[PDB]
Symmetry: C3
Amino acid sequence: GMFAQLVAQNVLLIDGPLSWYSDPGLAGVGLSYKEDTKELVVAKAGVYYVFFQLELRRVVAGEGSGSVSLALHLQPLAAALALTVDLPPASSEARNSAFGFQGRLLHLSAGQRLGVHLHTEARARHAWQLTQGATVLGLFRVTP
Amino acid sequence: QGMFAQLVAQNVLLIDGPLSWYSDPGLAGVSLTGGLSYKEDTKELVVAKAGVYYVFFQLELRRVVAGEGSGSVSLALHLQPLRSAAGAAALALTVDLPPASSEARNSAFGFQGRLLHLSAGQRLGVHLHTEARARHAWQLTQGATVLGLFRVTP
Amino acid sequence: GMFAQLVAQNVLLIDGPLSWYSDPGLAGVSLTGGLSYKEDTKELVVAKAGVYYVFFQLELRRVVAGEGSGSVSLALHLQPLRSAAGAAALALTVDLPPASSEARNSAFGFQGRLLHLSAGQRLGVHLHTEARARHAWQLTQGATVLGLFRVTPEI
């Protein structure tokens, strides 16, 4: 009931909620993630510092332009955390990567279910992807 | 007690000066006091108990008239009254306003976090400075300019 | 308390490991815990093991008008690798746009994760750059920092 960090399984840019798996870099050490409805549920009530980050890679040279948003929602049914990252159009000496980070203090009641939904608005949507192991959701409590 | 805090600015217009703050309504309704009090007259945020804290603020803008808007806006957190020799801020943040274009976004976001040593009663002020042409074209989006901290020592 | 924060000495972008000094903004309490900085290896060693919230940041400024184009990367390495995990524990690349009409003249980046640090692990940061006019930018001094603190100290 102290902290939790997990990584997204998704790679392709498709609108909808992301499935996650526990951070393998944190294995050798009390919040749960239901695999069916892809929700992280908080065990103990408290004020947590919740944060996610998102890195994107361009996979097709010379294609892809738009933006990609990532919203965390108190579930069930604005968003608590909101992160939209820009995808630059392709050119010589243009970036092939993009990143965004955001953290905030959220009050989460005991049993509150969290959900993160990925939205994209981009021409040639297939030209960008989520880098494996780089879009992370984490949180830890600061007040019992 | 946990001794935490988080506020969000009432300011929208890009006008140089200190920001007005109010407590996070999403945290209104927690038992702990939250060791940080916003005094309304001087637009300062005094810290209750001394200690070491992770302090962060974020900034988000929207372009509110299409076509214009170019430059940057900066957020500066100063321990007040100023008692340093360099005059630098304890926390700074600069986000840039992209000019209007086809296939160009109408948002800007920035986030920065550090560890501060704030003594008991220390007053903090957050100042906004813009170096932007046609700055009336962008504003701080409602509820997005946030400042928060929490203590990392008992 | 088990926490630490470092400020980089470097301003000129050369590829290699950044050299640090303890953030004066916390001098009233020093570097409480057991975390110490080793100048010869430019690494910060971890005393008490456990899970930490780690973060670095990075701000660059164009210091020659009309020049400078590319991208710089910042990488945190955990030495030695624990369970083959430690290389690029935190990675962060930010681009430096070409100078042009109303173009960006500064660039910033932030990242923060929960890492499980072992007792005796060294933390190093490497700055790698890919720029056409490498000198036209540089690291704003005092702005590229690396800090951390513990949430739980289970071995």
